[PDB]
Design an enzyme around this catalytic site. Structure first.
Site, PDB file in Angstrom:
ATOM      1  N   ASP A 186       0.818  -1.223   0.000  1.00  0.00           N
ATOM      2  CA  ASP A 186       0.000   0.000   0.000  1.00  0.00           C
ATOM      3  C   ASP A 186       0.850   1.271   0.000  1.00  0.00           C
ATOM      4  OD1 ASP A 186      -1.670  -2.171   0.668  1.00  0.00           O
ATOM      5  OD2 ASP A 186      -3.051  -0.873   1.723  1.00  0.00           O
ATOM      6  N   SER A 200      -1.597   2.291   6.379  1.00  0.00           N
ATOM      7  CA  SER A 200      -1.835   3.258   5.299  1.00  0.00           C
ATOM      8  C   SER A 200      -2.541   4.563   5.666  1.00  0.00           C
ATOM      9  CB  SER A 200      -2.594   2.578   4.162  1.00  0.00           C
ATOM     10  OG  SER A 200      -1.873   1.441   3.747  1.00  0.00           O
ATOM     11  N   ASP A 235      -6.408   3.818   7.157  1.00  0.00           N
ATOM     12  CA  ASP A 235      -6.432   4.211   5.742  1.00  0.00           C
ATOM     13  C   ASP A 235      -7.049   5.604   5.537  1.00  0.00           C
ATOM     14  OD1 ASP A 235      -5.528   1.603   5.665  1.00  0.00           O
ATOM     15  OD2 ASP A 235      -6.978   0.882   4.176  1.00  0.00           O
ATOM     16  N   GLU A 268     -11.540  -1.313   2.197  1.00  0.00           N
ATOM     17  CA  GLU A 268     -10.227  -0.730   2.514  1.00  0.00           C
ATOM     18  C   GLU A 268      -9.814   0.392   1.582  1.00  0.00           C
ATOM     19  OE1 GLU A 268      -8.250  -4.753   2.280  1.00  0.00           O
ATOM     20  OE2 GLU A 268      -8.037  -4.422   4.452  1.00  0.00           O
TER      21      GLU A 268
HETATM   22  O1  LIG Z   1      -0.953  -3.928   5.616  1.00  0.00           O
HETATM   23  C1  LIG Z   1      -1.981  -3.069   6.155  1.00  0.00           C
HETATM   24  C2  LIG Z   1      -2.699  -2.355   4.995  1.00  0.00           C
HETATM   25  O2  LIG Z   1      -3.213  -3.372   4.086  1.00  0.00           O
HETATM   26  C3  LIG Z   1      -4.650  -3.197   3.994  1.00  0.00           C
HETATM   27  C4  LIG Z   1      -5.162  -3.579   2.590  1.00  0.00           C
HETATM   28  O3  LIG Z   1      -4.283  -3.085   1.584  1.00  0.00           O
HETATM   29  O4  LIG Z   1      -5.273  -4.044   4.967  1.00  0.00           O
HETATM   30  C5  LIG Z   1      -5.078  -5.381   4.498  1.00  0.00           C
HETATM   31  C6  LIG Z   1      -4.953  -6.395   5.594  1.00  0.00           C
HETATM   32  O5  LIG Z   1      -4.836  -7.718   4.996  1.00  0.00           O
HETATM   33  C7  LIG Z   1      -3.563  -8.066   4.372  1.00  0.00           C
HETATM   34  O6  LIG Z   1      -2.836  -8.982   5.245  1.00  0.00           O
HETATM   35  C8  LIG Z   1      -3.600 -10.209   5.510  1.00  0.00           C
HETATM   36  C9  LIG Z   1      -2.829 -11.101   6.503  1.00  0.00           C
HETATM   37  O7  LIG Z   1      -3.604 -11.247   7.701  1.00  0.00           O
HETATM   38  C10 LIG Z   1      -3.907 -10.991   4.215  1.00  0.00           C
HETATM   39  O8  LIG Z   1      -4.832 -12.051   4.504  1.00  0.00           O
HETATM   40  C11 LIG Z   1      -4.473 -10.092   3.087  1.00  0.00           C
HETATM   41  O9  LIG Z   1      -4.387 -10.806   1.847  1.00  0.00           O
HETATM   42  C12 LIG Z   1      -3.747  -8.719   2.977  1.00  0.00           C
HETATM   43  O10 LIG Z   1      -4.416  -7.821   2.047  1.00  0.00           O
HETATM   44  O11 LIG Z   1      -3.836  -6.048   6.453  1.00  0.00           O
HETATM   45  C13 LIG Z   1      -4.306  -6.051   7.838  1.00  0.00           C
HETATM   46  C14 LIG Z   1      -3.370  -6.873   8.718  1.00  0.00           C
HETATM   47  O12 LIG Z   1      -2.972  -8.070   8.041  1.00  0.00           O
HETATM   48  C15 LIG Z   1      -5.669  -6.743   7.834  1.00  0.00           C
HETATM   49  O13 LIG Z   1      -6.468  -6.202   8.888  1.00  0.00           O
HETATM   50  C16 LIG Z   1      -6.211  -6.328   6.473  1.00  0.00           C
HETATM   51  O14 LIG Z   1      -7.178  -7.268   5.990  1.00  0.00           O
HETATM   52  C17 LIG Z   1      -4.890  -1.718   4.316  1.00  0.00           C
HETATM   53  O15 LIG Z   1      -6.260  -1.506   4.731  1.00  0.00           O
HETATM   54  C18 LIG Z   1      -3.906  -1.538   5.477  1.00  0.00           C
HETATM   55  O16 LIG Z   1      -3.511  -0.180   5.603  1.00  0.00           O
END
Ligand SMILES: OC[C@H]1O[C@@](CO)(OC[C@@]2(O[C@H]3O[C@H](CO)[C@@H](O)[C@H](O)[C@H]3O)O[C@H](CO)[C@@H](O)[C@@H]2O)[C@@H](O)[C@@H]1O
Ligand SMILES: [Ca+2]
Length: 519
Positions: free
Chosen positions: A97, A165, A250, A349
């Site tokens: 991100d 993010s 975000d 997201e």
């Molecule tokens: O990394 C945080 C950042 O990523 C965002 C999406 O771009 O949240 C994504 C999220 O999922 C990611 O990580 C998980 C692993 O648990 C994975 O299953 C998935 O494929 C990924 O996209 O990251 C957090 C923590 O893992 C989760 O709560 C969320 O689903 C963004 O919103 C955030 O800023």
């Protein structure tokens, strides 16, 4: 011997359902349906909208499908070979991100002393290593190799305090006002997220074309949720079995015409329209014909996992207005959600609002496998091997009144399996100077954690144009850039980056070994 009472009687008759074929249990459930028309939490992504988005994804319609990328051209980001915030040593990080420093009113990528600036999440694959870094390149320079890393915004750290993010814009004095997610994991490893802001001052060494982080000032928490409009951490704690998502992240900065500043962010609804068993009985969550809604109702009741997911789903895209203390903001007003998905999804997201002409466009990314309707999202995995989408809405007003684009809200849909090099996520629309009807869609390519193979790292995707139509529709365009191009101009297009879904084409969307590999 219960009898159908109220509006539900009409519903059952309209649906062609034989009332005498209903059991007492079914009648008792039907009698619990609440037919209130009052929208409690903004424009909703309904159960029907979700079904339509999934169906559209499966159709792989050129209007919405993410373009195929030439897999052979994708490289790890050279600037990702860099000092890691959690080790202090140079390592090969991946990058996901990311967001440009952009003008707050127009969203245009800012020109800072002849440079473009991007802040992004980076870390070592398969390490809980979530921190943000500053990347920079000469303004308008399309060469992915030319990006450099100024390092982690907050210096060295640990998983106890993470940065997720946000967004960034320039202050008058040339510092960056950064909006980001501060995450504290000290309470039983939970992702306790808060909207935060800090002011970042840069040093430029002109002769070395080198930018470094000089000062980070005014770091503080802006918003944690109010409890009514948006769920708080304490509220989440009270009820969590392990099935409830936490969201307060975000933050996307946008200014209106009068210079008022807002943050648009991902959260969950609070007591204004809270998650729970009651949500299954709110007819307005369904959003189809009465007859289709009735089928959905019985589907949710009959499937234990769907029912459980429905009880916990309450994703929201929220908005707050900030006070006028630019470098040290506080919240001035908390609004009802712009969009919410009670009963439907617990994760939407990376919200992104862009003003185009006199209209505000709101986009967000979602993984449909976070939706309640297992049957719908499982079908997307079967067809395409992924379940990602970008959704979108349009309003005449910034703080309310959003209308879904392309009927259901669908804007982009997954086109390749999640474990391919060319899988993408975290779509982020950037406006284009001199083109008021198009947006440049940026994203990262390759999923995190070496799921596409050791050494295949999340990296910046080739960007592509999206046409915005005044009739509330959108169309993917066959116009693509180099990896990591945030600025569309007359030198941006690189047709060599375009792929095809063919096994042995040199520009295949699949790398060797991916075509026919298990998902
Ligand atoms: O990394 C945080 C950042 O990523 C965002 C999406 O771009 O949240 C994504 C999220 O999922 C990611 O990580 C998980 C692993 O648990 C994975 O299953 C998935 O494929 C990924 O996209 O990251 C957090 C923590 O893992 C989760 O709560 C969320 O689903 C963004 O919103 C955030 O800023
Ligand atoms: Ca929830």
């Amino acid at each position: 011997k219960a009898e159908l009472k109220g509006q539900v009687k009409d519903i059952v008759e309209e649906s062609g359902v034989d009332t005498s074929k209903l059991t007492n249990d079914q009648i008792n459930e039907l009698n619990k349906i609440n037919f209130s028309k009052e929208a409690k939490s903004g424009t909703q992504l309904t159960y029907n909208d979700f079904k339509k988005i999934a169906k559209t994804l499966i159709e792989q319609d050129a209007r919405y499908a993410i373009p195929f990328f030439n897999a052979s051209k994708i490289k790890n980001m050279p600037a990702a070979k860099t000092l890691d915030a959690q080790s202090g040593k140079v390592e090969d990080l991946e990058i996901w991100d990311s967001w440009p420093v952009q003008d707050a009113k127009t969203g245009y990528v800012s020109n800072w002393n002849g440079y473009q600036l991007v802040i992004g999440m980076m870390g070592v694959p398969n390490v809980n290593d979530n921190h943000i870094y500053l990347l920079y390149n000469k303004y308008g320079d399309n060469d992915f190799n030319h990006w450099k890393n100024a390092g982690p915004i907050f210096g060295l750290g640990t998983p106890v305090i993470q940065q997720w993010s946000g967004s960034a814009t320039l202050n008058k004095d040339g510092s960056i006002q950064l909006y980001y997610t501060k995450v504290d994991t000290s309470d039983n490893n939970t992702n306790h997220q808060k909207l935060a802001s800090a002011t970042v001052y840069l040093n430029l060494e002109k002769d070395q074309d080198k930018i470094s982080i000089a000062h980070v000032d005014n770091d503080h928490i802006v918003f944690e949720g109010d409890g009514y409009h948006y769920q708080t951490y304490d509220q989440w704690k009270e009820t969590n079995k392990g099935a409830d998502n936490i969201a307060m992240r975000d933050a996307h900065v946008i200014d209106d015409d009068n210079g008022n500043r807002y943050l648009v962010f991902e959260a969950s609804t609070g007591t204004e329209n809270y998650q729970g068993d009651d949500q299954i009985y709110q007819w307005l969550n369904y959003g189809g014909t009465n007859k289709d809604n009735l089928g959905d109702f019985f589907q949710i009741l009959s499937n234990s996992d769907i029912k459980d997911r429905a009880k916990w789903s309450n994703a929201a895209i929220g908005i707050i207005k900030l006070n006028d203390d630019v470098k040290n903001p506080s919240v001035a007003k908390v609004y009802s959600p712009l969009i919410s998905a009670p009963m439907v999804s617990d994760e939407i997201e990376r919200p992104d609002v862009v003003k185009l002409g006199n209209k505000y466009y709101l986009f967000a990314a979602t993984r449909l496998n976070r939706g309640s309707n297992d049957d719908a999202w499982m079908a997307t995995n079967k067809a395409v091997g992924d379940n990602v989408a970008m959704i979108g809405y349009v309003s005449d007003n910034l703080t309310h009144g959003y209308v879904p684009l392309n009927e259901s809200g669908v804007v982009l849909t997954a086109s390749v399996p999640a474990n391919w090099r060319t899988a993408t996520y975290s779509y982020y629309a950037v406006p284009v100077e001199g083109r008021d009807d198009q947006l440049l869609i940026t994203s990262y390519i390759t999923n995190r954690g070496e799921v596409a193979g050791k050494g295949m790292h999340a990296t910046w995707a080739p960007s592509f144009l999206l046409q915005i139509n005044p009739d509330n529709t959108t169309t993917v365009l066959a116009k693509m850039t180099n990896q990591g191009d945030w600025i569309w101009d007359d030198s941006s297009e690189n047709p060599d980056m375009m792929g095809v879904l063919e096994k042995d084409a040199p520009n295949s969307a699949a790398l060797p070994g991916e075509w026919g590999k298990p998902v």
